[PDB]
């Protein structure tokens, strides 16, 4: 198995489908994202196609088997409400946590600005993943708050079943 397998360090990779593009995060050696963005289908990343490891239409979340030589993000362990969201345009929007899976937007931005960011991971100022963006809440083209799935939900999804035939 002598393979160079040279790659650049990057916990978050760019993932896209045949309808839209979004970002995913690898937690515990497992990629994570929302179902409406990726869904239970093949994902084309920078390396190529990706195999499906976990799927949950009810929870709107899917995961892929992380290839070897990949990094992972630890869970948040600081009780910090403030969170940082990674946008596909290399933009970080400070989001204050207002619940287990609910947050608020300090700067009112158009929904288009947040589009293409679902699946991205949110990291607390300490430097640990806190969850993944799922959808934004807006009234008339302006989003004032956002919703994300905490990393704790991932533990129950994998524990409930391992998608084994």
């Amino acid at each position: 198995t002598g393979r160079d397998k040279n790659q650049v360090e990057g916990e978050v990779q760019v993932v896209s489908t045949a309808t839209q593009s979004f970002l995913a995060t690898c937690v515990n050696g497992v990629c994570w994202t929302v179902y409406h963005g990726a869904g239970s289908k093949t994902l084309a990343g920078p390396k190529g196609p990706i195999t499906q490891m976990y799927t949950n239409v009810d929870q709107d979340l899917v995961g892929w088997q992380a290839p070897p030589g990949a990094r992972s993000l630890t869970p948040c362990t600081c009780g910090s409400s403030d969170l940082y969201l990674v946008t596909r345009h290399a933009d970080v929007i400070p989001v204050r946590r207002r619940g287990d899976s609910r947050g608020s937007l300090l700067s009112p931005r158009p929904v288009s600005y947040l589009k293409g960011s679902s699946g991205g991971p949110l990291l607390c100022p300490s430097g640990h993943a806190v969850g993944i963006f799922r959808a934004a809440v807006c009234t008339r083209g302006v989003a004032k708050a956002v919703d994300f799935v905490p990393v704790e939900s991932m533990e129950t999804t994998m524990r409930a079943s391992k998608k084994k035939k």
């Binding site: 839209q20 979004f22 994202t33 929302v34 409406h36 963005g37 990726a38 929904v111 947040l114 589009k115 293409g116 960011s117 679902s118 699946g119 963006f133 799922r134 959808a135 934004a136 809440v137 807006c138 989003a143």
Partner: peptide, 4 residues
């Protein structure tokens, strides 16, 4: 709103 879903974004994805």
């Amino acid at each position: 709103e879903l974004x994805x």
